[PDB]
C-alpha cells in the first residue's frame, strides 16, 4: 500500500490505508472489476480468491471476472473453445508480428485470452 | 552509427569501498579456473557457430 | 607577486579544518582592486569587468566595472550587494563562515567590538597561545595593512547618488559612501561605473538609466523603478550517451549582463589623463 | 632441488650439517603467487561489476543485451568496458579523448565471425561495431558450475597444506558472464590498440592473423602494463595436433 | 545492475552523531576527527573523541557478575580546580546553547546540537538561513538534508526505545543522590525527564548507579555519588564537599625500585549516581 | 652529467617557451586550440609569439621583431604543402603567414611512445631505498607536443629568415631544397633544431 | 599481539644490552625510540625481521612479530 501511495504521489501520513482502498469502490461496481489493490491484499491474506456483488445484482464480480450468482468461480471447462487462437501457430504468429513491428528482441510475451461464464 | 558519445567523458569508477568488499566476499567462493574455462569455451563455441 | 586576495588571508586555525582558499589568480594583478575576482563573486555577487571608453589609436581609457550576479527575483537582503555597517552582519551569515573571515569583515566595517569578541573566543582554543594567536596576528595585520592602503587619508568628484531622476530629494547615497571604509569606498569606485563622465566640459553618457541603487541598507542590485532587470546565468552516465550521430548561429551575441552603472564623474580642466 | 647448511663454532671443529629440500619453499612460493593472482583478478572483476552498477542500469547484464531496442545501454556498457581495459593498461588515463561512435549489427551478413566487437573509422572518428546477437548467444550459453578444471606430488602437497572455508543476484553464472564480456572487450581493445598505433592496414593484418599481436603488443604491454587477463592461465585446444592434421 | 532490486545491504555503520559534520562550503574540504570506537554497535552513539571534546567524558567498562556482564560507564575528565560552567559535564536544554560555543563551531554541528536538544526553533532558523545562504540548491541543500536525515535517523532509533524504557516496569533507573539525606541531589529524576530521549539514553550509558538490585541481590558500587544533576545538567561535582582530585595523567628512584611490576589503582573518577533495579538478567 | 647539464639547459629553454605560453594566457591546451578552428586569433597569436621567441633566441642582441603580420589559417589540402605546415608568402608587399591547422592537429593528436620506449636514466636502487627509509603540471605527452610545435615553428622561422634576409626567390628555393641549413650553426645554438639529428634510411 | 608494549620493551632492552656489550666503555643509549609491531607480509622484509627506518627525523623500529613467533 505504501508503494502504491508513493507511486501515486500520495503522502503516507496524509492517506490512510482504509480510505486508500475505499478509493476504488467507485470502480468496483460501475466497471464490474476488482481493484488490483484488493486483489493484492487478498493474495497476501491467502499467503497468510475474491467474489462480491450488489443488492439485487444478478451476477457477481470476482477476481476471475463475471460469474453467475451462486455459480462456481469457474464455468464448465467446455463452455468456450479457444482452439482457433489458443494454439501455438496463432500465438507464434502474433508474437512474431509484435516483435517485427516493435523492432524488439526480448521481453515480449503473448498469451491467449480465456473467458469465464461470460465474454 | 545508432548512437555515440562525445569526446573526453570519464570512466564511471565506483567509490564505495564497502560495496567493493561486499562484492569480493560474494564472489570469493567462485573458482577462477571454472569461470575462465566456461568463458573461454563460450567464446570458442560462439566463434565456431559463426564460422560454420 | 603580491597576493592582494583579501579573504584568502584566512588560516584554518582549527587543526581539523583545512582552508583550500581556491580563489582567483587575478589577485596578483596590481590593479585598483583589493579583492580578486573569486572573492568578489562569492561575497559580493559581483563579476569583474572592464569598460573601454576611448580606444581609437593609443588612448585606451578602460574604466573598470563589475556585474550583477543577482537575478530579477531576489529582494531585500538577497539583492543587497554591499551591505552597510548596520546590516552587513545580518546580510552575511558570519556564523556560517570561518572566524578569520568574520574578523576580516568586522575590520572592513570597523566592528572592533566584534573583533574583540572573536579574539576573546579564540582565547579558549586548545592551541590558543601556540598558533591561534599567531594566526590572529597574521590575519589582523594583513587586513589592517590592506585597509590602510585603501584609505586615502593614511600616511575625485565622483558622485553616486547624483544621477537619480524622479527621486523626491536628498540623495545621501554619497553620505553613506563617505560613511563606508576606505576599502569599501575604493571597492565601490572600482566596481561601479558612473552613468555620466564629464571631462573639461564634455559629457559622455554610457546608459540612459542607472542600474544600481544606494541607500541606508547599502548597495543594491535594484532598479530606480519598475521590475528588476533580467539577469540570467565527468563521471560518465547512462544519460551522457548520445543518440545517433545526426538559429542565429552566424551572428554575435550581446551579453545579457547588468553592469554596475550608476553615478556621475566630473573631471576638471585635466585632459585625457593617461598615466 | 636441495641445499644444505653447516653450523660450526669458531674455536671448535665439531660441525653440524643439515639438509633442506627446496620443494617445500617451492610450494610456499607457488601458493603465494596463485593466491595473489586470484586476488588481483577477483579485485578487477569486482571493480568492473561495481562501475557497471555505478552506471545504474535497472536490468541485469544479459537482459540488457537481449533488449535490442535500448542501444543506448549497450553502447554505454561497451564503452565503459573498453575504457576500463584501456585504463588497466594506462592507469593514468580516465577518459578516451576522441569521441566514439557505436553501431549494433543484427545479421550474419553484417557480423564478422571471431570478432564480435570491432572498430573502423569514418575518416574522421572511430566507430565501434557490436554483434549484439553474438554477445547474447555467448552470455546465454549454458555454463558448467560443477566440474573442476586442471605434478601429482605438489598437487597432494597443496591439498594438504592449503585450507578451505566452508544479497547480490550474482551467481557464478553471472560472474562468468561478466568475465566473458571483459575478455571479449579486451580482445577488441587489443585489435583497436594495434589499429591506432600501427595503421588500418596493420589492423586488417592483425584481424587476419592475431599472431602479430605478439610483437605489436609485448613491445609495450608486458613491460609497462598489467598482464592480460588470459595470462592467468595457459589455454589450449583439446586434441589440437590431430585437429590441425584434420 | 549487480545488486538485487533494493535488497537493503548489511554493513557496519559509524554511530557517533558528530561524524556527519561537514563544511557547508563545498569549496572548503573538512574531515571531522572520529575515534574508531564509533564503529562498534553498542549503546554509545558518540565516539570517544567527540565525547571527550564536547562533554569532557571518557568511556569505560564495569565488569558485573558468575557470568561476567560488562556494564557501560563513563568517567570524569574534569580537573579538580575547574569551576562554574567548567563543571557542567552535560549541559541541560536551557544551558547547552551557552556551554557549547555555537558561534565558535561549525553550522552543521550547531544544527546537530539543536536537534539533539529539542530546539525546533533553532533548527528551523538554521535551515532557513542555509536556504538563503550560498549555493543552497546546487549541493549545500543536499548536504544539509543528508546531515539532518542522519541525525533524525539516529534520534528515531533511540527515542522509541528510550520511551519504552521510561515506561518499563522490569527495568527501573533513578538518577539522583541515593543519600536522600542530601541537598545536592534534588529532583534528579525530574531533570532526567526534562532531557531528550537520546540525551536520556546517553545519560544511562554514561552514569552508572551507586547501587544495583538484580532480582534479590543488591551490589553497591559506591558509598557515595561521584556526580550530580541539576537544572544546568550533569555536573561533575561532589555532592557533599571538596571536589575529587583528578590528576589527568595523560591525554590533554627507590620509590620505583620498590614499585616495580606492582598492581596500581587508577586515579580515574567514574560516574556513580542513583539507584537501578532490574528483574532477571535481560542480558 | 655534462650532457645532463645541456639537457637542463634545453629543458630551461622549453620552460621559457612555457613562460611565453602563460604570458599568452590560453585557457585551453595548444592541442584543443588548434583543434578549434574558430580560435583563429589564438592560433595566429601563438604562432607569432613563438616566432618572436625564436627570433630573440637566434639574435639575443636583437629584441626587435615584426610587430604586424598577415595571417591565414588554411584547412584545405590544396592550401597546404607537405613538409611545410607554415608558409610565408607575399601578396605584393603584404606578408602573409599561412598555417596548416589540420596538419598541426594531426601531429599533436599522434600518440607518443612515452611508456613504450625504455631509455637510460639516473637509476640507483640504493638511493631510492635510502630515500624510502629516510622518509598545475605538464605531462610527458604535453611536453612532447609542445616541443614538436616549437621545432615546427623553428623550421618555419628559419624559412622566414631566409625570406627576409635573401628574398622571396631564395625563400622558395629553400622550400625546394633545405640543404642550406645542414650546417645550421655557423645565434643558431639557441635553436633546438641544432641540438639533435634525425635521419631516414631505406629499409 | 596485544602485548605490544612488552614486545617493544624486550627489543629495546636487548638492544641496550647488546650496545653495552659492544661498547663496554659506553653506558649511554638512546632512551626513547618509536616502535611499530608489524604483522602483515607487506610490512616485513625477508631476512630482516627488525628494521630501523626514519620518518623524517623520527626513528622507527619495525618488528616482524609473526616471523619471531614462527622462529620460536
Ligand atoms: Zn566520531
PDB file of C-alpha atoms and ligand atoms in Angstrom, chain E residues 14 16-19 32-35 37-38 46-50, ligand 1:
ATOM      1  CA  UNK E  14      29.517   4.865  12.065  1.00  0.00           C
ATOM      2  CA  UNK E  16      28.650   8.911  16.612  1.00  0.00           C
ATOM      3  CA  UNK E  17      26.359  11.744  15.569  1.00  0.00           C
ATOM      4  CA  UNK E  18      29.240  14.171  15.099  1.00  0.00           C
ATOM      5  CA  UNK E  19      30.731  12.013  12.330  1.00  0.00           C
ATOM      6  CA  UNK E  32      35.892  15.505  11.380  1.00  0.00           C
ATOM      7  CA  UNK E  33      38.097  13.572  13.847  1.00  0.00           C
ATOM      8  CA  UNK E  34      36.370  10.321  14.828  1.00  0.00           C
ATOM      9  CA  UNK E  35      37.674   7.686  17.183  1.00  0.00           C
ATOM     10  CA  UNK E  37      35.196   3.205  18.584  1.00  0.00           C
ATOM     11  CA  UNK E  38      32.372   4.847  16.637  1.00  0.00           C
ATOM     12  CA  UNK E  46      29.076   9.237  20.321  1.00  0.00           C
ATOM     13  CA  UNK E  47      32.694   8.383  19.649  1.00  0.00           C
ATOM     14  CA  UNK E  48      35.393   8.759  22.269  1.00  0.00           C
ATOM     15  CA  UNK E  49      36.855  11.797  20.514  1.00  0.00           C
ATOM     16  CA  UNK E  50      33.610  13.765  20.370  1.00  0.00           C
TER      17      UNK E  50
HETATM   18 ZN1  LIG H   1      33.299  10.156  15.780  1.00  0.00          ZN
END
